[PDB]
Design a protein around this ligand. Sequence first.
Ligand code: NA
Ligand code: NA
Length: 323
Amino acid sequence: GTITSQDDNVVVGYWHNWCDGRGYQGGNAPCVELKTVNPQYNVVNISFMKVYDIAEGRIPTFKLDPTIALSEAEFIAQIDTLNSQGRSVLIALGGADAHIELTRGDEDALAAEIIRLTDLYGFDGLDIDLEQAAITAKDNQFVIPAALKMVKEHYRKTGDNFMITMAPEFPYLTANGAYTPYLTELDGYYDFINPQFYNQGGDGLWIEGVGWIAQNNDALKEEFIYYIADSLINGTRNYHKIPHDKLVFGLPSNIDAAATGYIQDPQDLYKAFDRLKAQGQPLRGVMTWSVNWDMGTDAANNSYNQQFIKDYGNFIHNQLPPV
Ligand code: NA
Ligand code: NA
């Protein structure tokens, strides 16, 4: 394929390489064809590159789920189509039960496999989306950055920007937190970070004048968004710094997609994002788990009807470009 990278704001959505996932509230996530994904998701993350069976070896790979009933050829064409629309398709490394437990020395083979898949499917980059147990498993903190540097450099040689993103759960981004080796090793290689501001229950931050602001408090959601992002983009309040032009706010699509973190009132995001913009530090966009959930159903089989991309797609795409 042709490496197709993002120079302006993004709306990121994950795409499930499986069918009929059950939700946190009993709903259903269909498998969907790439070509059915709403075009306002201009970064689509194929979930997941993983180890399928450890008897196959330590190096994760990607195998298109045959239940989805696309041939490799048809999947590849759909990626070419997205690329022709100016949209990126990343491979998301990790996910639940991925069995990624790499040993020092594995970076060469992991880099070779990323390059292979990239060239074959026409992926535009990789998203680091490790499960909690993987973040510090074995030599992952060393191997995964070492491999991605070699991948970045390989594609830089041919004038291509192989995108590198990550999806840390936000508690792991405290200063010296478990995800910080990935961030420091890959500083100047990663394009943007899309943390998960969901599934962390009552984790949060204390702000003098406001109080305790939890990720699951729907009365203080503007405050949560504004203050957690302000902390990250400035490296304050004991958070690792991620520059504002490289921070994308990750969210559940609806209450089926995650246990906690769903934004009940989209105006809380609009206002938080406008406060960050007004101080000269606008964010790079939003991300969601997941496009399948946005296209999914509740427990009564009522369609979620793309509400996430309705709420946020125009809002983000009509912002000024970065820099
Ligand atoms: Na591509
Ligand atoms: Na509120």
